[PDB]
Structures are given as structure tokens and as C-alpha cells.
Design a protein around this ligand. Sequence first.
Ligand code: MET
Length: 239
Amino acid sequence: DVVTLTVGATPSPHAKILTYINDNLAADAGIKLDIVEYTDYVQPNTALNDGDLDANFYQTVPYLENAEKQFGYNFEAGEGIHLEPLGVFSNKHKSLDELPDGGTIGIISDTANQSRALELLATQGLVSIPEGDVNINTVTKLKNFDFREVEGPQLVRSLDDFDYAVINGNFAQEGGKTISGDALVVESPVDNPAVNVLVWKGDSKKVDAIAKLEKLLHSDEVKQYIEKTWSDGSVIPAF
Ligand code: MET
């Protein structure tokens, strides 16, 4: 009666953290992990919904709340494990002030993350968000440039085409990039609601096993693994 759990995860940090747990902690907890790596945001929630995964570990609390609102998903989430500060990246400039007149900024296409990237740009004086649904058509541009919506896994590649791109940590990681080494502008980690959580479906038969994985993901061992593995500011424990 060891329970096996199929968990979907983006490769870095999430699959790495899950692999540390699998290889170091799962056996003592009486669980086995079957890690499935995913490279986009749509697919792990669909697989959790449709019955292919027991849990996923890739998404932020605000993205989850939006997915439940837009799609009706019946999911349950755990405590914040870690934060990935959002960054503005570029291969053409080292300062956002060098945004050419009619220049371009790549921006993700999902609601929650486009909204978060738009806020980050507001802290830099580049867009104005009305007080009160935040997207490229509802913000006011305060300098002359164009946004270009790009699908998440195309963000790092879009740096070849555009002056800048706003890029979530998991994608920056895939592209060999770090916050310390490569972010032009770094989202503040203070009072940041975009913590990453374990998500499972409300009716799982495996809730004893998933509560064990939740406890392992918020252990001192996992915090130390995160702090040892990422000291470049790209992945910060949220506990
Ligand atoms: C799928 S919501 C964004 C998740 C991403 N790993 C982040 O923390 O920004």
C-alpha cells in the first residue's frame, strides 16, 4: 500500500524540486512520484481535469483563480511553495529606457500572466492601468511602442525579434536565463501573491497521498534544496 502519484510539472524549478523529493524523501513518506514534465500552462490543468494526473505543480495562485473562474475547474490548492520573480528580459538592450520609439515588447497571451506583466511595466512608468480587467487593449501606453502577444514557450525565442519580452521564471529557466544575470527589471518579492502551489482535483481518491506530498513540498529539506540550487534570485522559497 505505497500510493503512486502522477504529478505534472514544468521542468525548472518544479520538476527538479519534485525529483529531489522523489529521490530523497518520498520513500520515508510511503509515496512514489511519477513526474510528467509539461512546457506550457494550458496542458497540466487540462490533464488534471480530464483524469490523467493526480496533481500538478506549476501554477501560481492568481493563475489558478483565473482558470477556475474562466473554465469552472473544480480544483484544490496547497500552500505557497515558492515565488519566481517576473522579469523583463532582452538581448538588444540592458535598460528599459532604451525602448526605441515604435519598439516592441513581447508579452504572454494568457489573462493572469499578461495582467501580471502589465503591472510590472506599470511600476516602471511604461503603462497606466485604470483603477477598477487588465490586458494589452485596456492599459494606456505612456511611451510609443507595441506589445506583441506571444505564447508562453515562445517568449525566450521572441527576444531574437523584439526589443524586450516579459518572461515568467520557468520559461527564463528553460532559456538559460536567470534573474541575477539577465533580468533588466525584476518584480518585487514583497507582498507578491504569485506563489506556486500544488493543485489537485476536489474529488481525488488519493487525498492521503497528496497531503503527504504537500507536507514534503513545505519541508525544511525542500527549502534548503531550493536555497542551495537557486541563489541567483530566480526561485525564492515562500515559507
Ligand atoms: C502557470 S502561472 C505562472 C507560473 C510560473 N512558474 C510563475 O511562478 O510565474
